[PDB]
Design an enzyme around this catalytic site. Structure first.
Site, mmCIF file in Angstrom:
data_model
loop_
_atom_site.group_PDB
_atom_site.id
_atom_site.type_symbol
_atom_site.label_atom_id
_atom_site.label_comp_id
_atom_site.label_asym_id
_atom_site.label_seq_id
_atom_site.Cartn_x
_atom_site.Cartn_y
_atom_site.Cartn_z
ATOM 1 C CG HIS A 40 -0.517 0.414 2.468
ATOM 2 N ND1 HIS A 40 -0.205 -0.483 3.468
ATOM 3 C CD2 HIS A 40 -0.290 1.645 2.983
ATOM 4 C CE1 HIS A 40 0.212 0.178 4.534
ATOM 5 N NE2 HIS A 40 0.163 1.471 4.268
ATOM 6 C CG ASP A 84 0.011 -3.934 2.827
ATOM 7 O OD1 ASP A 84 0.526 -3.477 1.783
ATOM 8 O OD2 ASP A 84 -0.353 -3.208 3.784
ATOM 9 N N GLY A 175 1.787 6.832 8.592
ATOM 10 C CA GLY A 175 3.166 7.261 8.372
ATOM 11 C C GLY A 175 4.174 6.231 8.845
ATOM 12 C CB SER A 177 2.239 3.014 6.141
ATOM 13 O OG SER A 177 0.980 3.306 6.691
ATOM 14 N N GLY A 178 4.420 0.477 6.286
ATOM 15 C CA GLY A 178 5.517 -0.138 5.557
ATOM 16 C C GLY A 178 6.738 -0.429 6.404
HETATM 17 N N1 LIG Z 1 -2.920 1.624 14.175
HETATM 18 C C1 LIG Z 1 -2.411 0.746 13.143
HETATM 19 C C2 LIG Z 1 -2.128 1.533 11.883
HETATM 20 C C3 LIG Z 1 -1.031 1.307 11.043
HETATM 21 S S1 LIG Z 1 -1.032 2.390 9.693
HETATM 22 C C4 LIG Z 1 -2.488 3.105 10.286
HETATM 23 C C5 LIG Z 1 -3.206 4.228 9.628
HETATM 24 C C6 LIG Z 1 -3.073 4.571 8.288
HETATM 25 C C7 LIG Z 1 -3.883 5.672 7.964
HETATM 26 C C8 LIG Z 1 -4.611 6.152 9.049
HETATM 27 S S2 LIG Z 1 -4.305 5.236 10.483
HETATM 28 N N2 LIG Z 1 -2.933 2.551 11.435
#
Ligand SMILES: NCc1csc(-c2cccs2)n1
Ligand SMILES: [Ca+2]
Length: 223
Positions: A40, A84, A175, A177-178
């Protein structure tokens, strides 16, 4: 990272920042020329930033290297976030040292109860928005498959696991993420999704990296 701690500069040497004019995702350096991130996080024009602490300041240990290619998992579904995971190849090999270092792939899957380190430059607020400049860290346990499935009915596949705290307060966030989930010096997870951040009964969901080791190795071997 919500409810975490300041890691300390270059204390997480496999942590990368993916930059397209700005930080947009984390990643993990798995050898001198390859990074693992979330599917993603896919976009064009990625520069991999290694050796980062403060992502807004050049502090002297950074290596900035453009991606030559990205490979999203062939079975990635962006609706369900199943599979993912994505690989990013660097245009040139990173110079490995104590502050820029690869993280080992797992040889075995980590069990529920295993204590792990989650890190990133994501939002630090569960309600508001505040983005840190320096890398944040969170120690968090892997949760049971049953508790993960009960938290998110109908949404947890065999390629996902939950980690964190059902009481809330401590979690990954936008943020992050990944980025890495590391347990016993092995990359066991990738920051994938959740429902908000640090909310009660809504722990972070992570890509189960041990399921992808064969794909990662074979992909690297031919690319
Ligand atoms: N709380 C887990 C998590 C990991 S990435 C994420 C979000 C991405 C976009 C809004 S919140 N939430
Ligand atoms: Ca920096």
């Amino acid at each position: 990272i919500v409810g975490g701690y300041t890691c300390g500069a270059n204390t997480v040497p496999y942590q990368v920042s993916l930059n397209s004019g700005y930080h947009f995702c984390g990643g993990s350096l798995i050898n001198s020329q390859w990074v693992v991130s979330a599917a993603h996080c896919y976009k064009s024009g990625i520069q991999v930033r290694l050796g980062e602490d403060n992502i807004n300041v050049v502090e002297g240990n950074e290596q900035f290297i453009s991606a030559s290619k990205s490979i999203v998992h062939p079975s990635y579904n962006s609706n369900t976030l199943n599979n993912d995971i994505m690989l990013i190849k660097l245009k040139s090999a990173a110079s490995l040292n104590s502050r820029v270092a690869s993280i080992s792939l797992p040889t075995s899957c980590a069990s529920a109860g295993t204590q792990c380190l989650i890190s990133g430059w994501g939002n630090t607020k569960s309600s508001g928005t505040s983005y840190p400049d320096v890398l944040k860290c969170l120690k968090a346990p892997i949760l049971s498959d049953s508790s993960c499935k009960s938290a998110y009915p109908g949404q947890i596949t065999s390629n996902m696991f939950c980690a964190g705290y059902l009481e809330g307060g401590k979690d990954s966030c936008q943020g992050d993420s990944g980025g890495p989930v590391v347990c016993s010096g092995k990359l066991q997870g990738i920051v994938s999704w959740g429902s908000g951040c640090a909310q009660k009964n809504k722990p972070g969901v992570y890509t189960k990296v041990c399921n992808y080791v064969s794909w990662i190795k074979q992909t690297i071997a031919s690319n």
